[PDB]
């Protein structure tokens, strides 16, 4: 506290996406300690365009990156891609039923990438894909932010921070 | 915490520049919270070198750096460009004629880049353009500070504070 | 601000590894301040698989890694290798029996890297070996997470704490400057 | 608590190297505000080896690095140099006579770069010089330390941290 609402965003021609950092989670020790439980992720929210200038929130698709899929983004060259596969019941007999599948290619010029996202659900026949294009400029906003909060992300601050004033084995 | 006036200038024979962070603008809430309605950016200030090369900061001219496009300047390579255009009148009320543009190309040298502002506007006539050269190592001092400052510009930084135990 | 246990873990086939910044520790003096007197670092921990996504920790090896080591990690390029080797005190009058060898090498499919362990002991027969590939992506995370503690290892936030409010080479010569003038 | 003292060094063949950073200083106004009146900077300190495994700190030579001076240093690829020249009677009467030149260079192999340090005095007939190779490694440490001191060293943390939420100018 005070807890602020942030995210930054892109708004497109065809849509838009917000990207917004999540806290990871926590669990307590002995002595007053704590251990890091589950890590913080980014959070992507895509909206279809709605009538100019505006865009229609209510069919939007979410979309997590976590800490490894934010390595992926970081790491990618100019001409490079990604793909990432999420599906609630991987493994499950019912798995392949609801996914969405996230692509990260170059554009066809050379001028930034496309973040395209794939949204399927068997069960009420839904098949809606969004992609939004991001120039280099844009992009370059998302590899100095996920830089920033990545370490917040694996709760490494709360770590350091206690590195304050106030080789163990025969190895 | 008190009020502190930062700003890392470059002096240099024709002009001097100075550049400043600006803050982001929050929204109050429902219970306690708070969410953000402008991001901040960074200030550049150009000055005319009057004499004995001091400079003029009366006939100073500003740009804005918004996120997007401190991102350009991050990501630009040592052969690359990129041009910004503000216009106040972006076409709801009149067409306008009064407009800043800011452009950032190599040296012919290749020893940097150099920083280029044109100032216009039909209400004064007026019609300026400061050119100031910057080093790569001064490149570099803004890359780094940039970087640095961009998290913050996005208010990113109110948000990760609450990633702790409780 | 209570202390908290984190750790980078990357699970594979064959092992699993976990990354965890350690401390520095400081010295006090008498101005009313402190001294650094040893560097930070970061654990390594190697854990061969015992099952699916499961892991046998109470065979598990570790590795430490100092800045200057972190330093190779974050600078590696896409084909390039690095080697640490660890003995309890080197040269020294006795150097002792045992080691441990890390090496960082590019994948064959040049996808990533792979850290492989070695550990030899000669007071038993014990010469444990694990290897763990690292994709590009995984990599980056270390590079980033590593660059974020290298200042914290050193120290250098906590000095630079101190650059709250309350250039003429003259802080080179121990202001002797009797010798700048005849 | 308060203030605390440190320093990597870097402890080679015939010589050693200690990087520090210094603070920036403020100055008050009347608006009960301060203004940043003096950029912080990194201080080095080159020690040459009295012995195998000592140093000679009592003959150190110390030399100033700039905000400016310090980007030249981060952004140095694997095959550029750069070098500084410090006097400390610039605009003065005689300059030209006493000065501190470091150089940084790539090393033959590629595998780093040497910082060489010379020391000069004409008015005494002092002439020094003070050489040690930096390996990629320990380089990488020092771009780390420095991109993250650097915002400090120019004041911008003291901004940043009233960003809180308790065209325009264009």
């Given at each position: 506290?005070?807890?602020?609402?942030?995210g930054?965003?892109i708004?497109?021609?065809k849509?838009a996406?917000?990207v917004?950092?999540?806290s990871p989670?926590?669990?307590?020790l002995?002595?007053?300690?704590?251990?890091?439980?589950?890590?913080g992720?980014?959070?992507?929210?895509?909206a279809?365009?709605?009538?100019?200038?505006?865009y229609?929130?209510?069919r939007k698709?979410?979309?997590?990156?976590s800490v490894?899929?934010?390595?992926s983004?970081?790491?990618?060259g100019?001409?490079?891609?990604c793909?990432?596969?999420?599906?609630?019941?991987k493994?499950?007999?019912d798995?392949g039923?609801?996914?969405?599948?996230?692509?990260?290619e170059?554009?066809?010029?050379?001028?930034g990438?496309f973040?395209?996202?794939?949204?399927?659900?068997?069960?009420?026949?839904?098949?809606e894909?969004?992609?939004?294009?991001?120039?280099?400029?844009?992009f370059?906003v998302?590899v100095?932010?996920?830089?920033?909060?990545?370490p917040?992300?694996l709760?490494?601050?709360?770590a350091?921070?206690?590195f304050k004033?106030?080789?163990?084995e025969?190895?």
């Amino acid at each position: 506290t005070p807890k602020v609402f942030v995210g930054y965003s892109i708004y497109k021609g065809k849509a838009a996406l917000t990207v917004e950092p999540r806290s990871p989670e926590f669990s307590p020790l002995d002595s007053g300690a704590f251990k890091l439980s589950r890590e913080g992720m980014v959070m992507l929210q895509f909206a279809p365009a709605a009538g100019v200038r505006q865009y229609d929130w209510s069919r939007k698709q979410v979309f997590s990156l976590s800490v490894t899929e934010i390595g992926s983004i970081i790491s990618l060259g100019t001409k490079d891609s990604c793909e990432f596969f999420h599906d609630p019941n991987k493994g499950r007999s019912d798995e392949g039923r609801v996914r969405k599948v996230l692509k990260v290619e170059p554009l066809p010029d050379g001028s930034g990438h496309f973040f395209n996202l794939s949204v399927q659900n068997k069960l009420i026949n839904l098949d809606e894909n969004i992609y939004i294009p991001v120039t280099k400029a844009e992009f370059a906003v998302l590899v100095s932010a996920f830089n920033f909060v990545m370490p917040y992300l694996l709760g490494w601050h709360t770590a350091v921070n206690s590195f304050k004033p106030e080789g163990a084995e025969l190895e």
